[PDB]
Structure 1
Amino acid sequence: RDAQRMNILAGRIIAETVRSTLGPKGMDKMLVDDLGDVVVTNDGVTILREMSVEHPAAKMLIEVAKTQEKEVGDGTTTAVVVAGELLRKAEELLDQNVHPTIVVKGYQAAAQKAQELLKTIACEVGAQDKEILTKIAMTSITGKGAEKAKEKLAEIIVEAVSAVVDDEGKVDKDLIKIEKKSGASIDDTELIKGVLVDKERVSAQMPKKVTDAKIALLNCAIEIKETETDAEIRITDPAKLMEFIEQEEKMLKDMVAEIKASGANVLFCQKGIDDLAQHYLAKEGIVAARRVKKSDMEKLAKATGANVITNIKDLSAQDLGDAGLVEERKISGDSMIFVEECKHPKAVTMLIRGTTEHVIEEVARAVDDAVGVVGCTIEDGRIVSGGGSTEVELSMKLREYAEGISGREQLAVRAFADALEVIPRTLAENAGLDAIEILVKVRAAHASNGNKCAGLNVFTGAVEDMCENGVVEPLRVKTQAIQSAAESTEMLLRIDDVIAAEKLR
């Protein structure tokens, strides 16, 4: 009859299914299709990418989740859960024959007020505090499962982001490369200022350590060259077969000789190298190598100011780079070259070691997500208490602000505050504790002059300080969550007419 009555209860099917999969714990409810492609993965946004939709109302809430994921990378599921909880409470007031106009404005007023309340609560942090940067790092890796040396990994990751601090105060993830190389264990983890490579020197006669070496890049290969124009070899006299072998002796002499005249102590190459070319580099004594990714040939020139040289004949001194200290040694595994550059570090890297290929890949994913959490703090410089210790504080202040709004509509803004208690309730139910007798203790810590960092810890299972245990989350995730949640609910309250048309392009 009314239709709308049946669409409100439809939204209570997606939020509940993606409610337990939030936080450390969370059982997976896989609804595989008839094909049988089971993909057990405790994830939320992934469930929305492969699932048949029943009503068009459930499709609009997916757009706001994708735009927020690429910009943040985490916390998008915290909005759809709290969103659905708001519609369930609105039914208590809908029965009173309330008009949607006065209801939709009640949430916008409380949401707009929360934008100013979340600022004073956010604590300021500098780009050199070695006490807050270390806590936010260890909190993210704890959930990965690596009790071998998580304390050391938190001290090295903070030393890198704290050293590549540009003048404007931003941070680029491209300036931190990753290297997956097996070793003895994680204890051998160390961050080198530069770039490593397992390509050992082809000849042992080459120098083992050279200080202030001129880097030289060659985009072409060191083999038989060929003119850009069309050309084909033609043989008719069998006596000329020996001249071709002798002709290469001259081309591979004056060409390679120019490298030494330019003052190039180190050389690099991508493709293979001619067999006879190994003799020229033996008498001169210059470092060389082969097989190098094209992407690596760009960071070296960008990190030192060098320029690629496609023709050795057109080589110059300005195009040469400047290596800090090159040397080949071993560090619990296969020997590798260390092309360091501490005189002016423009792009560092990171090396991780493990016992097996399956172990390094696990921690390899944590270093990427860790930079995202700390990467946004250095840019904004504002953080808030974690563990859901932000909504319970605002809910008590909105009651005072709701008193100023006279008339028979103050109950609307008040009902929105009571619905924000779902965050501390989900984490409490997953821990196996009652969420009715514990909600009173969290209020004592925020009564009058209580601390502004109290929260419930899932591990210990009792109210503690988020700053002491190390629980903390960015501020941008909270602004976008309240901002998106404030606009997401509008998609349901504003609409008031079923669309039963035909032919819509």
Structure 2
Amino acid sequence: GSAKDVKFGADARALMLQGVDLLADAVAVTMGPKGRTVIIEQSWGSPKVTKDGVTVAKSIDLKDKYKNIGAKLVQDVANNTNEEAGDGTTTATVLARSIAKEGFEKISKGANPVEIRRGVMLAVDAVIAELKKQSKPVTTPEEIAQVATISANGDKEIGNIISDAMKKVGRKGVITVKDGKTLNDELEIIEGMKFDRGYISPYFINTSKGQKCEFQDAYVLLSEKKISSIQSIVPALEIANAHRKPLVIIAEDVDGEALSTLVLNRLKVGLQVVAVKAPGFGDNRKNQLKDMAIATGGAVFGEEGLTLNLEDVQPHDLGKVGEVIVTKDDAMLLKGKGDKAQIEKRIQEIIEQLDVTTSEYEKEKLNERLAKLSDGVAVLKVGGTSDVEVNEKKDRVTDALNATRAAVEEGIVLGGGCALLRCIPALDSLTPANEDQKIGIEIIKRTLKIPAMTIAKNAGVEGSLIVEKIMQSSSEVGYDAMAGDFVNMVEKGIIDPTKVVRTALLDAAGVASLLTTAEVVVTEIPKE
């Protein structure tokens, strides 16, 4: 144990609050429109450029120990808010700073900080209840378009793109974004059962195009194991040639000898066939082959429990699809006739599975299979020209996407902070058990006015003035910063998710209130 150092009372309080104020002034700019980006130095390549408040937050590290403690207690709020709701980081940080500063003023010699924490918790409960009461669900895609248009920092193309994605894939589809290439954004819909793996032999190339193999109404072979012996591969090709239709071979791997047979019958007379390996790592590829068989209609081969030997295959034992396309690094199955009721039951199985089980990575490929079997997958290849532009725009896009998915399931509320200001009468409605909880109530009451204050600040206007004049106005009337005036939000097209707001408020309030009761700080000696 390294020799440590201790500090008491107002000293440690002032140092920690200074550190938190440093970290929070670093970030509080990036709220709403008129916020301003932040450049961080990447140690190896180009620096990062952001508006996000966790890259900003998680990047900051302070030399002094106590200020470092402040920075850590802010970054934990940021990180929890991120991992819980994805967006609402800046709000978390600013509310945390305000709550901490208010806490480090009522710390008397007669006050009991734990009661302060309790009262803060009561306030948070009351305000979150008032939020959920004043929420409202999302129904029309106009609301989705609006929310997405917001969370790109006021970009409308992002809103339209996410709207079209959620419409052509469904409100619980699987959309994902990749680093775009061209100057502009792109919304691609990977439809059908498609996956990253190309035709093994470049002799199946019947496309007269960029390395494609195109079949129509072809049969399918689905082996969990490899295909080594000629005796194994031969009867399948026999049945295919008897029917005189193209054949796909989705299996673990193709022997060079059966491959030689294939290429022999392909170069000359030309038995329409094609060879492709399995989809993925271990068990996941097994389940995916099962799903592929049940989708196309047929039966997986190479089983353990029944094992379905290839020697005895049958014309109703093959996978059948309308069209198949293969490119050197991926293939697509289109019209698998797989007993739509049966695939429905499969879907119900895997959906109850995801409902019960999840690990944030299990459920990832879970929904992967769901979307790959039911309705496409949306990719969002973005514009941009520099890597830093790419990172910026992609960050904003992903943030908007997470906000939209949070808003689709749980209700929305009037944007621009108006919800909390409307919830303040709830705080006026509480009755504290004693003085200390009332102190905490007044702390949260002051805190609720903080965010719109910060926003008006960023706009370059009078914070408290705008906050008061908003509180005087109606329930739905509030302040736009872009138009710099008062309007109805939903009329104007500004709303926000309820889940993001509630999670951010809860995280910030909890961590800051816990921080307040600190009395004595111990730190490592500054040796090295």
TM-score, scaled to structure 1: 0.70
2:448 to 408, 414, 420: 420
Give the CA deviation at 1:353: 6.6
2:61 to 38, 51, 70: 51
Q: Sort the Cα spacing of 1:184 and 1:408 in 2 relative to 1 into closer, same or farther, 3 A.
A: closer
Higher relative contact order, chain-length normalized (CA < 8 Å, sep 6+): 2
Is the counterpart of residue 210 in structure 1 residue 216 in structure 2? yes
Give the CA deviation at 1:329: 12
Q: Sort the Cα spacing of 1:259 and 1:181 in 2 relative to 1 into closer, same or farther, 3 A.
A: farther
Is the counterpart of residue 483 in structure 1 residue 506 in structure 2? yes
Give the CA deviation at 1:280: 2.0
Match of 1:7 in 2: 12
Give the CA deviation at 1:73: 1.4
Q: Sort the Cα spacing of 1:207 and 1:14 in 2 relative to 1 into closer, same or farther, 3 A.
A: closer
Is the counterpart of residue 137 in structure 1 residue 152 in structure 2? no
Q: Which amino acid aligns with 1:194?
A: G
1:434 to 426, 451, 462: 462
Q: Sort the Cα spacing of 1:299 and 1:348 in 2 relative to 1 into closer, same or farther, 3 A.
A: farther
Is the counterpart of residue 115 in structure 1 residue 128 in structure 2? yes
| 3-state SS of 1:160 partner | helix
Give the CA deviation at 1:208: 5.7
* Distance (Å, rounded) in 1 between the aligned partners of 2:145 and 2:52: 27
| 3-state SS of 2:28 partner | coil
* Distance (Å, rounded) in 2 between the aligned partners of 1:50 and 1:409: 34
Match of 1:294 in 2: 280
Match of 1:339 in 2: 334
Match of 2:264 in 1: 279
* Distance (Å, rounded) in 2 between the aligned partners of 1:329 and 1:284: 17
What is the CA deviation profile of residues 10-36 of structure 1, one whole-angstrom value per residue up to 9, with x for unaligned ones? Answer: 223332223223445234264889x99
**Greater helix fraction, Structure 1 or Structure 2:** 2
* Bigger shift: residues 12-21 or 296-305: 296-305
Q: Sort the Cα spacing of 1:50 and 1:434 in 2 relative to 1 into closer, same or farther, 3 A.
A: closer
Q: Sort the Cα spacing of 1:254 and 1:299 in 2 relative to 1 into closer, same or farther, 3 A.
A: closer
What is the CA deviation profile of residues 174-226 of structure 1, one whole-angstrom value per residue up to 9, with x for unaligned ones? Answer: xx566888789768x56364245796861259996634x5433345666xx37
* Bigger shift: residues 420-429 or 75-84: 75-84
* Distance (Å, rounded) in 1 between the aligned partners of 2:491 and 2:472: 19
| 3-state SS of 2:205 partner | coil
Q: Sort the Cα spacing of 1:265 and 1:443 in 2 relative to 1 into closer, same or farther, 3 A.
A: same
- 8 Å CA contact 2:224–2:300 kept in 1: the answer is yes
Q: Sort the Cα spacing of 1:472 and 1:2 in 2 relative to 1 into closer, same or farther, 3 A.
A: same
- 8 Å CA contact 2:138–2:411 kept in 1: the answer is yes
**Rg larger in 1 or in 2?**
1
Q: Which amino acid aligns with 2:403?
A: V
| 3-state SS of 1:390 partner | helix
Give the CA deviation at 1:114: 1.5
What is the CA deviation profile of residues 376-414 of structure 1, one whole-angstrom value per residue up to 9, with x for unaligned ones? Answer: 3343x3122222222221224423435x77869745522
Give the CA deviation at 1:321: 3.5
What is the CA deviation profile of residues 219-269 of structure 1, one whole-angstrom value per residue up to 9, with x for unaligned ones? Answer: 5666xx37xxxxxxxxxxxxxxxxxxxxx7x88755633555699744145
Q: Sort the Cα spacing of 1:428 and 1:156 in 2 relative to 1 into closer, same or farther, 3 A.
A: same
What is the CA deviation profile of residues 133-184 of structure 1, one whole-angstrom value per residue up to 9, with x for unaligned ones? Answer: 33223333455x6x7x556524422313537xxxxxxx464xx566888789
* Distance (Å, rounded) in 1 between the aligned partners of 2:380 and 2:496: 26
| 3-state SS of 1:131 partner | helix
What is the CA deviation profile of residues 309-362 of structure 1, one whole-angstrom value per residue up to 9, with x for unaligned ones? Answer: 357436456764443x326699xxxx9967256977524123557788879967
- 8 Å CA contact 1:79–1:481 kept in 2: the answer is yes
* Distance (Å, rounded) in 2 between the aligned partners of 1:498 and 1:374: 41
Q: Sort the Cα spacing of 1:60 and 1:50 in 2 relative to 1 into closer, same or farther, 3 A.
A: closer
* Distance (Å, rounded) in 2 between the aligned partners of 1:356 and 1:484: 34
Q: Sort the Cα spacing of 1:407 and 1:42 in 2 relative to 1 into closer, same or farther, 3 A.
A: closer
Q: Which amino acid aligns with 2:427?
A: L
Is the counterpart of residue 461 in structure 1 residue 508 in structure 2? no
Give the CA deviation at 1:83: 1.7
Is the counterpart of residue 256 in structure 1 residue 240 in structure 2? no
* Distance (Å, rounded) in 2 between the aligned partners of 1:50 and 1:408: 34
Give the CA deviation at 1:424: 0.7
Alignment of 1:25-40 (within 5 A): 25-28=35-38, 30=40, 39-40=48-49
1:267 to 218, 231, 248: 248
Q: Which amino acid aligns with 2:417?
A: G
| 3-state SS of 1:480 partner | helix
* Distance (Å, rounded) in 2 between the aligned partners of 1:181 and 1:41: 18
| Identity across matched positions, percent | 19
Match of 1:105 in 2: 118
1:384 to 388, 413, 417: 413
Gapped regions of structure 1 (runs ≥ 5): 164-170, 227-247
Give the CA deviation at 1:374: 3.0
Match of 1:160 in 2: 168
Give the CA deviation at 1:423: 0.7
* Distance (Å, rounded) in 2 between the aligned partners of 1:433 and 1:97: 39
Q: Which amino acid aligns with 2:10?
A: R
- 8 Å CA contact 1:253–1:280 kept in 2: the answer is no
- 8 Å CA contact 1:262–1:315 kept in 2: the answer is no
Match of 1:235 in 2: none
**Greater strand fraction, Structure 1 or Structure 2:** 2
CA RMSD of aligned residues (A): 4.7
- 8 Å CA contact 2:325–2:331 kept in 1: the answer is yes
- 8 Å CA contact 2:427–2:445 kept in 1: the answer is yes
* Distance (Å, rounded) in 2 between the aligned partners of 1:336 and 1:40: 37
* Distance (Å, rounded) in 2 between the aligned partners of 1:19 and 1:407: 32
Q: Which amino acid aligns with 1:134?
A: A
- 8 Å CA contact 1:262–1:316 kept in 2: the answer is no
- How many residues align structurally? 450
Give the CA deviation at 1:482: 2.5
